[PDB]
A paper describes a structure:
Drosophila [name] belongs to the amidase PGRPs and downregulates the immune deficiency (IMD) pathway by cleaving meso-2,6-diaminopimelic (meso-DAP or DAP)-type PGN. The structure of the [name] domain comprises three α-helices and one central β-sheet composed of six β-strands, similar to the bacteriophage T7 lysozyme, a zinc-dependent amidase. The main difference between amidase and non-catalytic PGRPs is the presence of Zn2+ in only amidase PGRPs, which is coordinated by two histidines and one cysteine. We generated mutants to characterize the amidase reaction mechanism and solved the X-ray structures of wild-type Drosophila [name]-LBPA/PC and its mutants in apo form or complexed to TCT.
Our results show, however, that the activity of the H42A, H152A and [name] [name]-LBPA/PC mutants depends on the substrate type and is either significantly reduced or completely abolished. Y78F and [name] [name]-LBPA/PC mutant structures were elucidated to 1.30 Å and 1.40 Å resolution, respectively. Both mutants Y78F and [name] [name]-LBPA/PC share a similar fold with [name]-LBPA/PC wild type with a RMSD on Cα of 0.49 Å and 1.12 Å, respectively, but in different space groups, P6122 for [name]-LBPA/PC_Y78F and P1 for [name]-LBPA/PC_[name]. However, major structural changes were observed in [name]-LBPA/PC_[name] structure around the mutation. The loop between the β6 sheet and the α3 helix is drifting apart from the active site with a RMSD of 2.37 Å, calculated on the Cα from the residues 148 to 172. This deviation is due to the loss of interaction between C160 and Zn2+, where the cysteine is replaced by a serine. We showed that Zn2+ is totally absent in [name]-LBPA/PC_[name] mutant as already observed in the structure resolution, while it is still present in [name]-LBPA/PC_Y78A mutant and [name]-LBPA/PC wild type. Finally, the addition of Zn2+ to the reaction buffer used for activity assays allowed a small residual amidase activity of [name]-LBPA/PC_[name], whereas the absence of Zn2+ in the buffer totally abolished the amidase activity of [name]-LBPA/PC_[name], which is consistent with X-ray structural data. These data suggest that the C160 residue is needed to retain Zn2+ in the active site but not essential for residual amidase activity if Zn2+ is present in the media.
Numbering used by the authors: 14 to 178
Write the structure that this text describes.
């Protein structure tokens, strides 16, 4: 279920900065725009659209997230493991930031998206990129703290590793 950056046709990063040791945090995001992607070709386009917005419109080094999750249930590599992100203030150098593609302000993502996120986390721990005792957070805990978080936040609040901050 894991697609590399070259698999979705990513532009190279402008610059890459690494952080050391396994990430102590996992942070769950949604894209808002682009909207939910239904097939692998559509989700590859969603990843390029986010990268283009972050690199070309905002002048950032790369798509801000570590990984994306499509409606196809696939995992898309963004900056990847142990790369400083641009997704969560105070956590960019100590987390894996996972974006579920789509507008998940209120609605619950489909199961294959939730399953892909759990599989990515398990993979990251198994390969030594995520701390085994990682802390799981929602974006409304670290970044947009007045966002209510919706059914997605309620869902991740029930997962093992979910942490109050």
């Amino acid at each position: 279920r894991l697609l590399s950056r070259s698999d979705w046709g990513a532009r190279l990063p402008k610059s890459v900065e690494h952080f050391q040791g396994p990430a102590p945090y996992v942070i769950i995001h949604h894209s808002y725009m682009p909207a939910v992607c239904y097939s692998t070709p559509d989700c590859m386009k969603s990843m390029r659209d986010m990268q283009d917005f972050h690199q070309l419109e905002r002048g950032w080094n790369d798509i801000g997230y570590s990984f994306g999750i499509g409606g196809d249930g696939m995992i898309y590599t963004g900056r990847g493991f142990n790369v400083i992100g641009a997704h969560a203030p105070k956590y960019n150098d100590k987390s894996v930031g996972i974006v579920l593609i789509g507008d998940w302000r209120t609605e619950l993502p489909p199961k294959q998206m939730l399953d892909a996120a759990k599989n990515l986390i398990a993979f990251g721990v198994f390969k030594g990129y995520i701390d085994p005792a990682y802390k799981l957070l929602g974006h409304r805990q670290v970044r947009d703290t007045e966002s209510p978080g919706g059914r997605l936040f309620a869902e991740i609040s029930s997962w093992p590793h979910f942490t109050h901050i």
